Amino acid sequence: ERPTFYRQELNKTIWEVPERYQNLSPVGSGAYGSVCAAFDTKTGLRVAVKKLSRPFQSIIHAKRTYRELRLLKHMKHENVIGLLDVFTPARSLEEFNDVYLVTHLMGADLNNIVKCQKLTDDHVQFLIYQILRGLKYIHSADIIHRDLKPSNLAVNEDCELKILDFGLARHTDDEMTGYVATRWYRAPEIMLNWMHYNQTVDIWSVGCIMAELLTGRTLFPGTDHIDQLKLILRLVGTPGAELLKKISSESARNYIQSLTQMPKMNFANVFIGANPLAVDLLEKMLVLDSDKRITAAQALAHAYFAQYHDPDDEPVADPYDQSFESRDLLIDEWKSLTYDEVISFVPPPLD
Ligand SMILES: O=C(Nc1ccc2[nH]ccc2c1)c1cc(F)cc(N2CCOCC2)c1
């Protein structure tokens, strides 16, 4: 029942994988892992194999590893990354030190789509529809992406889309600093730590992405946190008393009140020539008060998507138990939980 593994050194890294995976070829690497393209001879699929780097070197790392495996095993939706396989060459918990994750080989992301091709309004409709379809699904499980951006959206030749999270980087203060795409899609409340955030942080991101699909340009390309906030407030207007109240931070609240008050702009005069239905949806997503933003489920029933909307084919997720997130365990306990999840993995059906 345990497959045969073979060894191979690729870019100073040892890969021990089941024989089914052939033609391994380095594709990427970072702080959390190294990635190879391969051909899965069992399924006929081109796949990406990610070897996690030092998955159990600290408590934080071990919990992270467990978290990713739990999320990936849970997500089963056409518009979200699916786990094809997970394995370890280890024959026992005692020798368990490496975890490999397998998924469909991406190809293009939305970033190279928007930069390299012309998108009609029909393409924008279809692409955003699919992001929202996936978000309805993850949000139904109380899973928040928090880092939706074009580089995290995979798109095939037929314009079919999946949501993933590549973040092999640790998301430090420095990488959020300056003129960086890493921050341009982030909701203002998380960018500035205004308050406890909710799942409509992801809807803000969708609005930023949709705007960029329509114009071909970044909506809020700030040169730093403050410059970006000024771009935002210029479009959407400065907050009123009602939203200010909700900003828990006192200093953050005092800074906002130092700003000259600005009204919401006319979106038809920003997104010149866009479908009026697209403009209306943008106005409902790019709302400063996260309590008042449209949700994924509400947006799927918006008239902009009339061509694609099918309420019998917009499924929700099975319940996802996240109690582990509030739990403090030792490295070896997180490691043993992870090992159990590796061993118990069951592959999805073929077709
Ligand atoms: O995409 C992810 N992992 C990933 C990336 C590239 C890979 N190559 C081979 C395996 C592999 C795994 C990923 C990880 C997560 F922790 C959460 C989410 N989700 C996505 C859906 O929204 C919630 C966050 C996606």
Does any domain span residue 171?
Answer: yes
Examine the domain organization and report whether 173 and 266 are in the same domain. Answer: yes
CA distance 304 to 123: 12
One domain, residues 88 and 67: yes
The verdict on whether residue 178 carries a ligand-binding annotation is no
8 A C-beta contact, residue 147 and residue 165: yes
Is residue 129 domain-resident?
yes
Mark which of 63, 91, 107 sits at the end of a domain.
107
CB environment 186-199: b (16+ within 10 A), e (fewer):
bbbbbbbebeebbb
Residue 81 CA to ligand 1 centre (angstroms): 6
The range of the structural domain enclosing residue 249 comes to 108-316
Q: Tell whether ligand 1 has an atom less than 6 A from the beta carbon of residue 143.
A: yes
Determine which helix (DSSP H) or strand (DSSP E) holds 230, and give its type and residue range: helix 225-236
In this structure, are residues 79 and 11 in contact, taking their beta carbons and an 8 Å threshold? no
Which CATH number covers residue 72? Answer: 3.30.200.20
CA of 165 to the centre of ligand 1 (A): 4
Give 97's contacts (C-beta < 8 A, 6+ positions apart): 55, 56, 88, 90
Query: For position 212, which CATH number holds?
Result: 1.10.510.10
Q: Of 203, 115, 198, which is closest to residue 155 (Cα–Cα)?
A: 115
Any known ligand binding at 299?
no
165 tagged catalytic: yes
Resolution, in Å, please? 2.0
Q: Which of 121, 165, 224, 289 is catalytic?
A: 165
For residue 59, how far is the Cα from the chain centroid? 24
Calculated CA dihedral for residues 206, 211, 213, 218, nearest 10 degrees: -100
Query: Is 222 annotated for ligand binding?
Result: no
Are 101 and 130 members of one domain?
no
Co-location of 295 and 160 in the same domain: yes
- Find out whether 244 and 262 touch, Cβ atoms under 8 Å: no
Both 152 and 43 in one domain: the answer is: no
Calpha distance 256→134 (Å, rounded): 34
Q: Which residues pair with 162 in a beta bridge?
A: 154
